[PDB]
């Protein structure tokens, strides 16, 4: 009537992704962790844009929407930030937001690429990830783009720009020993990269007592967070959600 004793084995760790394996766990917990990776890890992304002057071929909403998807290095600064609506400031402050300013005037006879390099933050710890660089817009001669922006804490459930992951590969039972999926012709199906079957075999023998365990993860970071940090913040956030629900339930019972 109690918790499992889950175990971790990291099979690969780079700056782009972490690949690991969780054993001795329910499928629901593993899927919830996989889901929290996408929807509930808070990062910093541009969410307030004031355009002082735009002469580009792209209208203002296009530029703002593109700026929102710029990923920002939010490794440690995100934890000490607060959500803006929770912050008591007069709408903005260094404790709930990070200011950006962009001012690019193409006064030359060559197409000026306005990239992420031109985004200038008021905080050195929160820069564009590429700072090759993400192209915001291209400008002709005599075209100015001048705006300020603010980037705030949020998570991917609200909007996909706060999604830190760039694809979360998730798997379990690579040889289909549980027959949670039924191949009409198992011969035709290529082996998973985690399969332990020899090539003369196409499918592990059926396991009547099996249960899903040994879930294989490959979490790729878009760049806002290191993948280690993505997984750790995900587990911390899910634990925080469960503890808050525990507090509310204790209040409701009392």
């Amino acid at each position: 009537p109690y918790a499992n004793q889950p175990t971790v084995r990291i099979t690969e760790l780079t700056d782009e992704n972490v690949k690991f394996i969780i054993e001795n766990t329910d499928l629901a917990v593993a899927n919830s962790i996989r889901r929290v990776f996408i929807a509930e890890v808070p990062i910093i992304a541009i969410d307030w844009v004031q355009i002082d002057a735009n002469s580009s071929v792209l209208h203002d909403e296009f530029i703002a929407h593109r700026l929102g998807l710029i990923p920002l290095t939010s490794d440690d600064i995100v934890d000490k930030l607060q959500y803006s609506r929770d912050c008591t400031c007069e709408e903005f402050c260094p404790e709930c937001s990070v200011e950006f300013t962009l001012d690019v005037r193409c006064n030359e006879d060559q197409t000026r690429h306005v990239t992420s390099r031109d985004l200038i933050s008021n905080s050195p710890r929160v820069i564009p990830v590429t700072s090759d660089d993400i192209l915001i817009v291209k400008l002709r001669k005599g075209q100015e783009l001048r705006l300020r922006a603010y980037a705030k804490k949020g998570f991917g459930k609200e909007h996909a720009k706060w999604n830190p992951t760039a694809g979360v590969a998730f798997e379990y039972d690579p040889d289909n020993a549980l027959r949670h999926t039924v191949y009409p012709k198992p011969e035709e199906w290529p082996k998973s990269e985690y399969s332990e079957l020899d090539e003369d075999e196409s499918q592990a023998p059926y396991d009547p007592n099996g249960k899903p365990e040994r879930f294989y993860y490959n979490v790729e970071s878009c760049g806002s967070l290191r993948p280690e940090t993505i997984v750790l913040s995900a587990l911390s956030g899910l634990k925080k959600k469960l503890s808050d629900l525990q507090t509310q339930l204790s209040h409701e019972i009392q």
């Binding site: 844009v49 004031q50 355009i51 203002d60 929102g68």
Partner: peptide, 11 residues
Amino acid sequence: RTKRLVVFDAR
């Protein structure tokens, strides 16, 4: 172009 402040959420 207008000189009134125009603000967009980046969504």
